[PDB]
Amino acid sequence: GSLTEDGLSYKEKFVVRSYEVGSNKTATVETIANLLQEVGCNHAQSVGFATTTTMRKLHLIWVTARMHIEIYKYPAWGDVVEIETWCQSEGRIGTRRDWILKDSVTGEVTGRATSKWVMMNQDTRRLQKVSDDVRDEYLVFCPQEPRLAFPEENNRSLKKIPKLEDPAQYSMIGLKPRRADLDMNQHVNNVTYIGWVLESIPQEIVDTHELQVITLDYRRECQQDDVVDSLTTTTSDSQFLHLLRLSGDGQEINRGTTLWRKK
Amino acid sequence: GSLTEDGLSYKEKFVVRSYEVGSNKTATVETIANLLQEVGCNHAQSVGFATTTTMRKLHLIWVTARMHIEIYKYPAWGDVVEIETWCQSEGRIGTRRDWILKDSVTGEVTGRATSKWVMMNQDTRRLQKVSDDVRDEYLVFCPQEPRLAFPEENNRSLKKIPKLEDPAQYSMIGLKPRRADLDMNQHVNNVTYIGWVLESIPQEIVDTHELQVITLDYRRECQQDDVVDSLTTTTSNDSQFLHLLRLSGDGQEINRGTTLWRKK
């Protein structure tokens, strides 16, 4: 991988592995999400950066508020996929990281993703607006003119997601993270929540449809000793409304939507 | 990746990824196990397979009976590890796949692994001895003289593992696979069982020790709708454990194993 010529974005190639694919012999959406996260980590490393600056002194970190992914073609086992990523400031609201997925052989865009990140104190878990002096520290690594993976005026990445009402049509209860679900800081990896959401989709939908779009909001994290219930209701192509909540008190951890195309 | 000069082994390099590491910023044993499985798949693909034409006609497959891994140094996040793998027939008992892990920068052996595979009918799940027709078909891809990752006389890879007696010292109950735990054939990936075994090790041991050796026997598979209980008892500077995975309901054994950990 490497930064591009202007130093304002980063590209990296990946060969799809045997254990990274589903029953269609193409990369799962969780494998895609892991690759997006890996290229984001490599971009931050390449420019000297969690992706923290003088935020370390104040115990501040970037945390994901929303992840949105659209896949047109899932790469096959053994295929090479090229991913380009970049960041942009969204004023004092937070930051945005965008990605473009391409087939290396054809050069065709096979997917796109966007994510919204907010600044939070790692100890109190209190959010805060991005101040001047921290904004300037990473503005030199971002394009100044807007560059959006989802430009379309009125698009799926900015839709408001409603809260699923009980009773849910489908559910998968008692979900728990194991050590492989944790990152280097012992926190549950953001991609595990995508897996948990998908667990309540019936197997017949997975066997006859392909996931085209997933939008996921992150409200609160699941701790290593917490247990999660995954809830889904059809709202329709097939569309679903999703809700992840703690098994005990019913505390919301995530809400989302998925759109699936018939194969 | 590529086959070596004599075409009797396969090598491949991997850069350790950010999500592949634990709290020490080094590759987990499950990341290592996934890389061993990936290099085995690429070796089979490079020589045209890992079932032969005769095996597909008879609905026969290779299944893992035992996995044994020893790690001296876990590669760090961003490091390049080189893995060499090869196979050998073990007469009519089955096949053996071996691996050697090396640090690409130093060329030093940082790990080694060995696995035993048996031939089984895909549908009835009945094991069978390897016939001559099948044996000759893959012998042209294996070294003829013995080549062992674990040559030592009384080495840990061939030890008999006893069955853990109730009550277990430690346990993790209600373990279930999710879709990410399944392979392309919708079967639970062999590496998930390694994770499940390790789930019953206390966090204090993981935080103060490093896993040096793991030996795991595979008796039966966990189906997508099955639930597993993971059981561990200390058997021991070094710490050793006896492990047992069994179905949550009837207590049917799925795996048994041992781990050896050294103090950091």
Ligand SMILES: CNc1ccc2ccccc2n1
């Ligand atoms: C992996 N995702 C998260 C989400 C929230 C966090 C809060 C404090 C520290 C780490 C965190 N990591």
Ligand SMILES: CNc1ccc2ccccc2n1
């Ligand atoms: C991934 N491991 C296994 C173990 C046993 C199997 C039996 C039939 C078909 C596939 C199998 N896969």
